């Protein structure tokens, strides 16, 4: 049903978390690491 | 493609959110980083805090208004003015209310944590500077602001709870990345990823409960402030009918679940924390406690949430229920009709949600895993996820009609 | 920087602009007669467009004020001059008395109108439409223009010339109806409003208050009419059978308990379980029950032998034949005697945001309150320019003296009017409604006191009274409907003591309004006196905030005399006033928000009607969509349940119901399977286009017109019809509050789904109709 | 030191922030309400918002070497 596409979306949304998460760790560590 | 770019807003809040959060966790002075149970969890009182005080004041804010209005409906002239008038006034009250409560949590968490926690860089020079007490109170109150300020803005683009879901996105994200999920098992914990497929099965189940146990009646009045109101006999042809009933709200299981965590928490860290193995209060008592989740969240919430008052406004503005056979009897008798449906459907809801926590519980018969991390976090992650779907649903589809195509 | 800093910042801004303009006025005094006329021609040629020529405003306004000096008078004040300026800006200058209003509006009206578009002037009531229309009129002929005001039945000339003319004066209620008048119109020659952007609102404090939408509903073809007549007769009498304990308060809704259920069985309908699929009967009982109770027939009065039940309600003053609802109008008729046939709908719109915000800006006059700015943000996006003219609030106003248990207070007020009468003070009162007003006069009569009553009894009376009320010792009583915004003037010497006197029957549903009735004493900048008499028993409190007042008083003290206002009496009531006002705000939002999504659906709908009226040969498009919709219907098939599937019996069957017409085309013809859309479309399209022209044989001239009546009536019909359904949807919103969130969510979903369903339907019916003859 | 007065500032920034939300309340708050239209522009108060985010990261640098 709609749900099937919802699941595909769920994976997609998750991709964002993985991707965004990477940014956080990256930038955040940047402040600590550099300075 | 699938994206059909249009929403100017979509990426905007998303990217913006990532920036604010990374700094938020790493934050100097706090950044205590963590819930799992006892060891994995953490906190002075028992609040898993990704960061010092912010999600906590959120829950606090929500709960403050929730229970207060619940047990005592009208302390002072504001049940609901007209819904809006009553609501805005209510929300303003909520803002200040949660704010102060956050402060209380501020000093307390500050004291216990700074003094004796697993590796903490925190230096101590007297109360170094303005005390980790006064100084942490600073980061705690001020901290409450940077998150709160962030949350509101988040509320503009993402959501009031978008911020929460992000928290889930991160935590939920942390483990699948395989940060540290390769360890204890009978030479396993790395095979049987069927578990991934099975969890997927869990996702499908979740969508089912929330369609709402749904159903409704008829009639429409409208009163403009003034002398009169109108009525209409019949006319118009169209599909679409009324739907009133509902399913449990967003994180109910978590609310009830936390209550369980309270006795269990005491048992894992008593003075000179005795991890009572004989009485393992991590898991063993769990069956009893879990049922406790059922009674408190399901039953009590449903009563107030169901808003006992409903038959009044309904029966009052001329209504005869519609659902599963033509409706009839008005008055209190109808509350009867509804009462049966609400508690009944709730039993159904209990079956699924409880099945969630239960699900790792059911599977873990043959080869158990010490790596529980998952489950609840999913219930929440999906929850906001579906919620965001709500934002797209309304936002989407512009005037389809004057498409280029005739 | 949001604060006084902005209001004050405003002060210098104008103070500067004013100085410059003021200089202009100075040199100009050399009696520029014909030269001024040249000025009218020069400026007229000058703008010719929305360019917002600011420079002109300085020289032009100067000509305006002076033009007035030549015309008659009323041109020496500031808040007005500045008024027009901020007005051009879209806010609200003024506060009343002197200031301007008459002249004020005229100033910006002149500059903007020059565009040649025609400008809108929002005025509360028709009597007023005439007011400003003539009062300012001389400068107009001077400036060589064509004024133009609209009125309930007519403006003496016609609608077309009226709007297209220069200045467009009128009442909003009308302006809305005119705008809407723009729907069924089979033709377009109908000048029925030339586009509507700009407007200044005279007594803006109201432009907001107009909560309930503006619907124009005429055509009611009641199939049921004969039944309703006999049936309603029985119905109303039935409720009469029942007693008082029906419980009807705080809202228009009503139902009854034990005696109620018992009554339901007591009269035809032995069936205890009435609800099952037989609410309709109950509907009749509730109808009368509500009618006989909810609105006293006396609100809904009938003019002398007019026998026409006319509703004066909602701050009006007698609106000829019409009704807010489908159930009520007929219900009360059942109560009175002559019963009507009609019950109809058509179109509705938000008077303000949907309408005004639909196009351009607004600048109101008078009310300075705090309550309006938020509103001025949410809907309009205007601000407030508070400015006192010469000698501010010269008048005195006394407190809300209170009295207990019953209207008996009004009795005391009566003696009060007398003492004033003896002192020779011209008085006036602003009562709540018709009934009370009458009783009020009756009291004066018992006492033997002269007076005039303009409680919408007769329109002509409103005229005589205007110059009449307040003529030294005079005594007048009128409804608030007459009670708001008027340039009244006292005769000579009248002001000798106190000046003017005003007594209110109570405190209205809103704070401003209460003030407004009061404000009715003070023009050109003179003194006066105001006082309010309220009763713990009156109305505002009787239903609203009664629960608390009781303890507050009972615990406080029962025994005493008539006058009191020591411990939070006036204080408490005031809180309730805002409270009640608050309810209005809340209901304001619901219809406002929903109607907003409606604004968009509606736009597509009649805008589409416009296109159809304008263009001739929709032919290829209409058929095409009719086919694409129909074919896709046969087409819907995909993996799934598959609505259709272009196969054999499956399509033949569903398609037959899809194409059920007396006409015949390949219906029987089976065995096929050349599905590329080219094939299916061509065959049906040919039968249409071909038969179309074959049909076309009737007449070039006549035939063209057919789509006119058909397209509009048919399309118009479906939407208005589905609009009634739209009413039911509002019920769905009633639901949203519990379960999910509350953003008008469920409504939005449904609004669209309903409407895509709506249009597809249109092509079906409108199409088949083109065939028959 | 810079930080000492800054700490006095940090509490201060907290207060302005707390107020901004209450005033901020007309649109709504916890949970949701209705998507008020007419929109929002960047509030004049937003300066406080900008100052806050800048402020915390500042603290991060300051808190440590």
Number of domains present in the structure of chain D: 1
Domains of chain C: 4-215+350-380 (3.40.50.300), 225-336 (3.90.1440.10), 396-567 (3.40.50.300), 598-771 (1.10.3060.10)
Residues with Cβ within 8 Å of B361's Cβ and at least 6 positions away in sequence, in order, are: none
Per the CB < 8 A criterion, the answer to whether C360 and C197 are in contact is yes
Q: How far apart are the first and last CA of chain C?
A: 70
B77 touches chain C (CB under 8 A): yes
Cβ contact B139–D59 (<8 Å): yes
Residue holding tokens 């760790």? A25
Phi, psi of C721 (to 5 degrees): -65, -50
Torsion of CA B348, B350, B354, B355, to 10 degrees: 0
| Closest alpha carbon to C744 in C730, C733, C752 | C733
**Cα angle value C171/C354/C253 (rounded, 5°):** 85
Residue holding tokens 């005739």? B406
Give dist(CA C613, CA B75) in Å, integer: 60
| Known binding-site residue numbers of C | 74-75, 80, 98-102, 487
| Closest alpha carbon to C476 in C466, C489, C484 | C466
Per the CB < 8 A criterion, the answer to whether C441 and C453 are in contact is yes
Domain ranges of chain B: 1-181, 188-221+239-372
Please state at what angle helix C4-28 crosses helix C54-71, rounded to 10 degrees: 60
| Known binding-site residue numbers of C for ATP | 74-75, 80, 98-102, 487
Per the CB < 8 A criterion, the answer to whether B322 and B215 are in contact is yes
Q: Which residues from B are below 8 Å from A when comparing CB atoms?
A: 14-15, 17-19, 21-23, 25-26, 166, 169-170, 172-174, 176-177, 200, 203-204, 207, 382, 385-386, 388-389
| Closest alpha carbon to C91 in C344, C309, C451, C385 | C385
| Closest alpha carbon to B233 in C714, C723, C344, C232 | C344
Select from D32, D37, D44 the Cβ nearest to the Cβ of C596: D37
Residues of D in contact with A35 (CB under 8 A): 61
| Closest alpha carbon to C90 in C370, C299, C359, C435 | C359
Give dist(CA B393, CA C749) in Å, integer: 8
Q: Is B358 helix (H, G, I), strand (E, B) or coil?
A: helix
DSSP string, B264-306: HHHHHS-SS----TTTTTTTTTHHHHHHHHIIIIIIIHHHHHT
Give dist(CA B169, CA B387) in Å, integer: 14
DSSP string, C408-427: HHHHHHHHHHHHHHHHT--E
D50 touches chain C (CB under 8 A): no
Residues in chain C: 773
Give dist(CA C351, CA C363) in Å, integer: 15
Residues with Cβ within 8 Å of C385's Cβ and at least 6 positions away in sequence, in order, are: C7, C10, C14, C82, C83, C86, C91, C92, C93
Give dist(CA B260, CA C338) in Å, integer: 71
Beta-bridge mates of residue C122: C170, C201
Residue holding tokens 């009162």? C429
Per the CB < 8 A criterion, the answer to whether B184 and B370 are in contact is yes
Question: A26 is in which domain, residue-wise?
Answer: 1-35
Mutate to test the interface with A, among D61, D62, D65 (most CBs of A within 10 A): D61
CA distance B202 to chain A (A): 11
Phi, psi of C601 (to 5 degrees): -65, -45
| Closest alpha carbon to C654 in C637, C638, C666, C671 | C637
Mutate to test the interface with A, among D57, D58, D60, D62 (most CBs of A within 10 A): D60
| Closest alpha carbon to C283 in B38, B30, B170, B233 | B233
CA distance B315 to chain C (A): 8
Residues with Cβ within 8 Å of B357's Cβ and at least 6 positions away in sequence, in order, are: B253, B257, B290, B293, B375, B376
Give dist(CA B24, CA B16) in Å, integer: 13
Give dist(CA C261, CA C608) in Å, integer: 50
Q: Is C282 helix (H, G, I), strand (E, B) or coil?
A: helix
Beta-bridge mates of residue C169: C121, C149
Q: Note the resolution in Å, 1 decimal.
A: 7.5
Give dist(CA C508, CA C518) in Å, integer: 11
Per the CB < 8 A criterion, the answer to whether C68 and C100 are in contact is no
Residues with Cβ within 8 Å of C759's Cβ and at least 6 positions away in sequence, in order, are: B401
Strands C119-123 and C475-479: unpaired
Sign of CA dihedral D50, D56, D59, D64: negative
Determination technique used: X-ray
Residues of B in contact with D52 (CB under 8 A): 145-146, 149
Residues of B in contact with D14 (CB under 8 A): 138, 141-142, 144-145
Select from B85, B221, B243 the Cβ nearest to the Cβ of C252: B221
What are the residue ranges of helices labelled H in B224-375? 252-268, 286-293, 301-305, 310-316, 332-363
Per the CB < 8 A criterion, the answer to whether C128 and C105 are in contact is no
Give dist(CA C628, CA B231) in Å, integer: 39
Strands C167-171 and C119-123: parallel
Residues in chain D: 65
Give dist(CA A13, CA A34) in Å, integer: 31
Per the CB < 8 A criterion, the answer to whether C432 and C423 are in contact is no
Please state at what angle helix B162-174 crosses helix B55-71, rounded to 10 degrees: 130
Per the CB < 8 A criterion, the answer to whether B234 and C719 are in contact is no
Give dist(CA B37, CA C257) in Å, integer: 54
| Closest alpha carbon to C324 in C412, C397, C252 | C252
Per the CB < 8 A criterion, the answer to whether B376 and B254 are in contact is yes
Phi, psi of B297 (to 5 degrees): -70, -55
Per the CB < 8 A criterion, the answer to whether B27 and B139 are in contact is yes
Token output for C640: 């799934």
Number of domains present in the structure of chain A: 1
Give dist(CA B42, CA B39) in Å, integer: 7
Query: Which A residues in the span 1-35 are in contact with D, Cβ-Cβ below 8 Å?
Result: 31-32, 35
Select from C313, C723, C730 the Cβ nearest to the Cβ of B226: C313
Beta-bridge mates of residue C363: C200
Cβ contact D36–C2 (<8 Å): no
| Closest alpha carbon to B267 in B250, B288, B253 | B288
Cβ contact D38–C378 (<8 Å): yes
Task: Show the 3-state SS of C577-634.
Answer: HHHHHHHHHHHHHHHHHHHHHHHHHHHHHHHHHHHHHHCCCCHHHHHHHHHHHHHHHH
Residues with Cβ within 8 Å of A24's Cβ and at least 6 positions away in sequence, in order, are: B18, B21, B22, B25, B170
Question: C533-566 burial, b if ≥16 CB within 10 A, otherwise e?
Answer: bbbbebbbbeebbeeebeeebeeeeeeeeeebee
Give dist(CA B182, CA B176) in Å, integer: 11
Residues with Cβ within 8 Å of C460's Cβ and at least 6 positions away in sequence, in order, are: none
Chains that touch B (3 or more CB pairs under 8 A): A, C, D
Give dist(CA B229, CA B231) in Å, integer: 7
Residues of A in contact with B378 (CB under 8 A): none
Q: How far apart are the first and last CA of chain A?
A: 51
Give dist(CA C160, CA C174) in Å, integer: 15
| Closest alpha carbon to B16 in B158, B149, B135, B148 | B158
CA distance B18 to chain A (A): 6
Cβ contact A17–B170 (<8 Å): yes
Distances from the Cα of C269 to the Cαs of C265, C272, C475, in angstroms?
A: 5, 8, 56
Token output for A12: 């997609």
| Closest alpha carbon to C695 in C717, C710, C680 | C710
Strands C167-171 and C92-93: unpaired
Token output for C533: 């008499």
Per the CB < 8 A criterion, the answer to whether B136 and B30 are in contact is yes
| Closest alpha carbon to C20 in C60, C71, C67, C69 | C60
What count of Cα atoms within 13 Å lies in the side-chain half-sphere of residue C134?
A: 6
Give dist(CA C4, CA C728) in Å, integer: 46
B-C CB pairs within 8 A amount to 210
Phi, psi of C687 (to 5 degrees): -60, -40
Chains that touch D (3 or more CB pairs under 8 A): A, B, C
Is B1-181 CATH 1.10.3370.10? Answer: yes
Token output for C483: 């009670």
Residue B330, classified by CB atoms within 10 Å of its CB into exposed (0-12), middle (13-18) or buried (19+), is: buried
Select from B26, B141, B156 the Cβ nearest to the Cβ of D14: B141
Question: B28-58 burial, b if ≥16 CB within 10 A, otherwise e?
Answer: bbbbbeebebbeebbbbebbbbbbbbbbbbb
Per the CB < 8 A criterion, the answer to whether C160 and C130 are in contact is no
CA distance D11 to chain B (A): 6
Q: How far is CA B370 from the centre of its chain?
A: 26
Token output for C434: 């018709």
D18 touches chain C (CB under 8 A): no
Select from D21, D29, D59 the Cβ nearest to the Cβ of B28: D59
Distances from the Cα of B80 to the Cαs of B64, C253, C579, C586, in angstroms?
A: 17, 18, 11, 10
Phi, psi of D58 (to 5 degrees): -60, -45
| Closest alpha carbon to B2 in A21, A13, C629, C756 | A13
Cβ contact D56–B142 (<8 Å): yes
Cβ contact D44–C741 (<8 Å): no
Residues of B in contact with D11 (CB under 8 A): 138, 141-142
Give dist(CA B302, CA B308) in Å, integer: 9
How many other CB atoms are found less than 10 A from the CB of residue B236? 20
Please state at what angle helix B376-395 crosses helix A2-34, rounded to 10 degrees: 110
DSSP string, B23-71: HHHH-SS------SSSSSS--SSS---SSSSSHHHHHHHHHHHHHHHHH
Phi, psi of B229 (to 5 degrees): -140, 170
Phi, psi of C123 (to 5 degrees): -135, 145
| Closest alpha carbon to C78 in C12, C22, C121 | C22
Residues of D in contact with C378 (CB under 8 A): 36-38
DSSP state of B223: B
Mutate to test the interface with C, among D25, D32, D38, D39 (most CBs of C within 10 A): D38
Residues with Cβ within 8 Å of B74's Cβ and at least 6 positions away in sequence, in order, are: none
Q: Is C429 helix (H, G, I), strand (E, B) or coil?
A: strand
**Region for residue C408 given its phi and psi (left: phi exceeds 0; alpha: psi -120 to 50; beta: otherwise):** alpha
Q: How far apart are the first and last CA of chain D?
A: 14
Give dist(CA C569, CA C493) in Å, integer: 37
Query: Which D residues in the span 19-58 are in contact with A, Cβ-Cβ below 8 Å?
Result: 57
Per the CB < 8 A criterion, the answer to whether C48 and C116 are in contact is yes
Question: D46 is in which domain, residue-wise?
Answer: 1-20+42-65
**Region for residue C648 given its phi and psi (left: phi exceeds 0; alpha: psi -120 to 50; beta: otherwise):** alpha
CA distance D6 to chain B (A): 11
**Cα angle value C81/C84/C85 (rounded, 5°):** 90
Phi, psi of A29 (to 5 degrees): -65, -25
Residue holding tokens 């550099």? A34
Task: For chains A and C, tell me whether 3 or more CB atom pairs sit within 8 A of each other.
Answer: no
Give dist(CA C591, CA C343) in Å, integer: 22
Sign of CA dihedral C114, C116, C118, C119: negative
Select from A10, A16, A24 the Cβ nearest to the Cβ of B22: A24
Cβ contact A27–B203 (<8 Å): no
Residues of A in contact with B388 (CB under 8 A): 13
Cβ contact B223–C315 (<8 Å): no
Token output for B177: 């990345």
Cβ contact B28–D13 (<8 Å): no
DSSP string, C481-535: TTSS-------SSGGGSSS-EEEESS--SSHHHHHHHHHTS-SSS---EEEEEEE
Per the CB < 8 A criterion, the answer to whether C441 and C451 are in contact is yes
Give dist(CA B386, CA B392) in Å, integer: 10
| Closest alpha carbon to C172 in C124, C102, C117, C225 | C124
Beta-bridge mates of residue C311: C319
CA distance C741 to chain D (A): 8
Q: CA of A5: which chain B residue's CA is closest?
A: B204
DSSP state of C703: H
| Closest alpha carbon to B228 in C312, C288, C340, C537 | C312
Residue C202, classified by CB atoms within 10 Å of its CB into exposed (0-12), middle (13-18) or buried (19+), is: buried
A-B CB pairs within 8 A amount to 61
Give dist(CA A12, CA B158) in Å, integer: 17
Element (H, E) at C123: strand C119-123
Phi, psi of C149 (to 5 degrees): -125, 150
Give dist(CA C747, CA C306) in Å, integer: 42
How many other CB atoms are found less than 10 A from the CB of residue C596? 17
């Amino acid at each position: 049903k709609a749900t099937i596409s919802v699941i595909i979306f769920s994976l997609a949304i998750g991709v964002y978390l993985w991707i965004l998460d990477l940014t956080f760790t990256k930038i955040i560590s940047f402040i600590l690491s550099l300075r | 493609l699938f994206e059909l770019k249009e929403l100017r807003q979509k990426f905007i809040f998303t990217l913006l959110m990532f920036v604010i959060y990374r700094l938020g966790s790493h934050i100097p002075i706090p950044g205590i980083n963590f819930a799992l149970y006892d060891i994995f969890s953490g906190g002075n009182l028992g609040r898993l805090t990704v960061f010092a005080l912010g999600v906590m004041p959120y829950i606090s804010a929500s709960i403050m208004m929730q229970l207060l209005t619940v047990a005592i409906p009208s302390l002072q002239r504001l049940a609901k003015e007209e819904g809006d008038y009553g609501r805005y006034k209510i929300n303003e009250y909520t803002k200040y209310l949660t704010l102060f409560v956050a402060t209380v949590q501020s000093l307390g968490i500050a004291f216990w944590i700074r003094g004796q926690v697993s590796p903490k860089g925190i230096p101590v020079v007297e109360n170094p500077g303005i005390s980790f007490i006064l100084i942490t109170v600073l980061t705690l109150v001020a901290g409450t602001m940077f998150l709160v300020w962030i949350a509101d803005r988040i509320t503009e683009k993402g959501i009031g709870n978008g911020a929460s879901l992000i928290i889930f996105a991160g935590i939920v994200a942390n483990f699948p990345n395989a940060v540290i999920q390769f360890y204890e098992k009978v030479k396993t914990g790395d095979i049987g990823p069927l578990t991934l497929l099975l969890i997927i099965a869990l996702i499908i189940a979740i969508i089912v409960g929330i369609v709402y146990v749904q159903e409704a009646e008829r009639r429409i009045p409208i009163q403009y402030p003034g002398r009169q109101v109108g009525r209409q006999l019949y006319a118009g042809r169209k599909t679409y009918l009324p739907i009133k009933i509902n399913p449990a709200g967003v994180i109910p299981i978590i609310f009830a679940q936390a209550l369980l965590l309270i006795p269990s928490t005491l048992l894992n860290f008593v003075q000179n924390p005795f991890i009572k193995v004989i009485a393992d209060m991590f898991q063993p008592g769990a069956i009893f406690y879990n049922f406790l989740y059922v009674t408190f969240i399901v039953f009590f919430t449903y009563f107030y949430t169901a808003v006992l008052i409903n038959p009044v406004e309904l029966a009052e503005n001329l209504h005869k229920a519609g659902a599963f056979i033509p409706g009839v009897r008005p008055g209190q008798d109808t509350v009867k009709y509804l009462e049966r449906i609400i508690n009944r459907l709730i039993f159904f809801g209990a079956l699924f949600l409880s099945v969630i926590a239960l699900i790792p519980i059911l599977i873990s018969v043959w080869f158990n895993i010490p790596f529980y991390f998952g489950g609840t976090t999913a219930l929440i992650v999906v929850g906001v996820a579906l919620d965001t779907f709500r934002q797209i649903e309304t936002y989407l589809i512009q005037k389809k009609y004057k498409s280029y195509v005739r | 920087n949001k604060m006084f800093d902005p209001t004050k910042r405003t002060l210098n801004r104008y103070e500067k602009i004013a100085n410059d303009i003021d200089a202009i006025r100075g040199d100009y005094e050399n009696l520029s007669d014909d030269a001024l006329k040249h000025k009218t021609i020069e400026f007229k040629e000058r703008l010719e467009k929305g360019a917002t020529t600011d420079d002109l405003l300085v020289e032009a306004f100067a000509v305006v004020r002076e033009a007035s000096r030549r015309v008659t008078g009323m041109f020496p004040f500031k808040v007005q001059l500045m008024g027009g300026v901020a007005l051009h800006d879209g806010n609200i200058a003024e506060m009343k008395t002197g200031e301007g209003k008459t002249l004020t509006s005229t100033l910006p009206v002149y500059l903007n109108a020059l565009t040649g578009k025609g400008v809108h002037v929002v005025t509360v009531n028709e009597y007023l439409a005439s007011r400003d229309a003539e009062q300012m009129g001389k400068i107009f002929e001077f400036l060589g223009l064509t004024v133009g005001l609209n009125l309930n039945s007519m403006s003496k000339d016609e609608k077309r010339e009226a709007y297209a003319a220069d200045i467009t004066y009128s009442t909003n209620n009308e302006l809305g109806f005119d705008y809407l008048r723009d729907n069924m119109v089979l033709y377009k020659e109908q000048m029925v409003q030339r586009p509507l952007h700009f407007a200044v609102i005279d007594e803006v404090d109201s432009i907001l208050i107009d909560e309930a939408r503006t619907p124009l509903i005429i055509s009611g073809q009641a199939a049921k009419s004969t039944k309703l007549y006999v049936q309603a007769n029985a119905f109303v009498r039935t409720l009469k059978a029942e007693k008082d304990y029906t419980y009807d308060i705080k809202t228009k809704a009503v139902q009854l308990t034990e005696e109620g259920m018992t009554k339901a069985e007591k009269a035809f309908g032995i069936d205890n379980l009435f609800d099952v699929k037989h609410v309709a009967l109950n509907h009749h009982i509730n109808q009368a029950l509500k009618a006989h109770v909810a609105m006293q027939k006396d609100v809904d009065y009938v003019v002398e032998d007019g026998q026409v039940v006319i509703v004066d309600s909602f701050t009006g003053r007698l609106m000829k034949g019409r009704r807010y609802s489908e159930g009520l109008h007929q219900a009360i008729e059942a109560k009175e005697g002559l019963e009507i046939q009609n019950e109809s709908m058509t179109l509705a719109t938000i008077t303000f945001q949907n309408y005004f915000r639909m196009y351009e800006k607004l600048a109101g006059m008078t009310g300075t309150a705090k309550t309006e700015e938020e509103e001025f943000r949410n809907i309009y996006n205007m601000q407030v320019v508070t400015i006192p003219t010469n000698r501010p609030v010269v008048r005195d106003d006394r407190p809300d003296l209170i009295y207990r248990t019953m209207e008996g207070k009004f009795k005391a007020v009566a003696e009060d009017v007398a003492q004033r009468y003896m002192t020779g003070q011209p008085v006036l009162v602003g009562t709540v409604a018709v009934e009370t007003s009458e009783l009020i006069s009756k009291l004066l009569k018992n006492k033997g006191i002269p007076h005039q009553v303009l409680n919408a009894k007769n329109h002509e009376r409103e005229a005589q009274i205007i110059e009449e009320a307040g003529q030294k010792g005079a005594v007048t009583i009128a409804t608030n409907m007459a009670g708001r915004g008027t340039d009244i003037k006292l005769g000579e010497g009248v002001k000798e003591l106190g000046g003017l006197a005003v007594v209110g029957t109570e405190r209205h549903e809103s704070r401003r309004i209460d003030n407004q009735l009061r404000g009715r004493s003070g023009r050109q900048g003179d003194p006066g006196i105001t006082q309010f008499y309220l009763s713990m028993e009156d109305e505002l409190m009787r239903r609203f905030g009664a629960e608390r007042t009781m303890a507050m008083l009972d615990r406080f003290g029962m025994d005493d005399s008539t006058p009191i206002q020591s411990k939070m009496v006036s204080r408490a009531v005031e809180s309730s006033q805002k409270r009640v006002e608050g309810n209005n705000f809340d209901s304001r939002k619901q219809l406002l928000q929903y109607d907003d999504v409606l604004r968009q659906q509606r736009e597509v709908i009649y805008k589409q009607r416009f296109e159809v009226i304008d263009s001739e040969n929709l032919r290829e498009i209409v058929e095409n969509m009719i086919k694409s919709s129909l074919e896709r219907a046969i087409a819907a098939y995909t993996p799934r349940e598959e609505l259709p599937e272009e196969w054999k019996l499956d399509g033949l069957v569903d398609l037959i119901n899809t194409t059920y017409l007396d006409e015949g085309a390949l219906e029987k013809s089976d065995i096929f399977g050349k599905e590329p859309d080219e094939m299916l479309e061509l065959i049906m399209d040919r039968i249409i286009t071909k038969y179309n022209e074959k049909e076309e044989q009737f007449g070039k001239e006549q035939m063209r017109e057919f789509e006119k009546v058909i397209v509009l009536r048919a399309v118009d019909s479906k939407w208005m019809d589905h609009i009634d359904a739209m009413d039911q949807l509002r019920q769905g919103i009633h639901l949203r509050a519990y379960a999910q969130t509350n953003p008008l969510r469920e409504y939005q979903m449904e609004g669209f789904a309903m409407f895509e369903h709506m249009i597809e339907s249109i092509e079906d019916e409108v199409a088949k109709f083109v065939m028959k003859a | 030191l810079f930080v000492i007065i800054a700490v006095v500032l940090i509490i201060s920034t907290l207060l302005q922030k707390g107020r901004g939300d209450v005033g901020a309340a007309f649109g709504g708050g916890m949970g949701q309400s209705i998507f008020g239209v007419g929109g929002v522009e960047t509030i004049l108060t937003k300066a406080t918002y900008w100052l806050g985010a800048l402020f915390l990261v500042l603290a991060l640098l300051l808190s440590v070497i």
